[PDB]
Paper text:
In the ethanologenic bacterium [name] ZM4, the gene ZMO0922 encodes a 148 amino acid polypeptide, which has been annotated as a putative [name] domain-containing protein (ZmASCH) that belongs to family 23. Here, we report the three-dimensional crystal structure of ZmASCH which confirms the fold of a central β-barrel core and reveals a positively-charged cleft with a pocket on the surface. In vitro assays showed that ZmASCH bound nucleic acids and possessed cleavage activity specifically towards single-stranded RNAs. The weak nuclease activity of ZmASCH depended on magnesium ions and the protein appeared to prefer the consecutive pyrimidine-adenine dinucleotides for its cleavage activity.
The structure of ZmASCH protein comprises five α-helices and a six-stranded β-sheet, the latter forming the central β-barrel. There are two and four protein molecules in the asymmetric unit of the trigonal and monoclinic crystal forms, respectively. The conformations of individual monomers are in excellent agreement, and all monomers superimpose with RMSD values of less than 0.3 Å, with the largest deviations in the loops between strands β2 and β3 and helices α4 and α5. As the ssRNA-cleavage activity of ZmASCH was dependent on magnesium ions, but inhibited by other transition metal ions, such as zinc or cobalt, co-crystallization of the wild-type protein with either ZnCl2 or CoCl2 was attempted. However, we could not locate any bound transition metal ions in either crystal form, suggesting that high affinity binding of the metal ion to the protein molecule is probably accomplished in the presence of a nucleic acid.
Author numbering: 6 to 148
Write the structure that this text describes.
Amino acid sequence: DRKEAVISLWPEFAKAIVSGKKTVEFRRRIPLPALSARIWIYATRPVKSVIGFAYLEAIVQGDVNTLWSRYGREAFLSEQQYRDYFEGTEKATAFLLRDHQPIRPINLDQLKEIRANFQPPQSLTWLRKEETQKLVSLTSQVE
């Protein structure tokens, strides 16, 4: 079961996902969540918090050039940032996201209380079902 995952992004991109501006997330060799998985968004420093989530509506696997042409507009990052991220490979994975949901940020200390040695994932981290319950139990509307 892979219905609940956390990924890290720099705060401008994280905020773009939870606001619905960024509906495509590009990745390089990442484990695949089950369809309609909830993808939690950890925004990196200085935010250092889970700031919301979105749902995985589709997974695309393709070449880097064509994926930029087809989905780059929904991905928010610049073409240079994209090509830098994919330097040295011609393969690319695109997560297509829907139903973005901002929340009051959940800080790194709370995440550590949930999982004692939580670290911002470099690719993705699965949530255990109890972890998912504790996290959901912390969720609130943005202030």
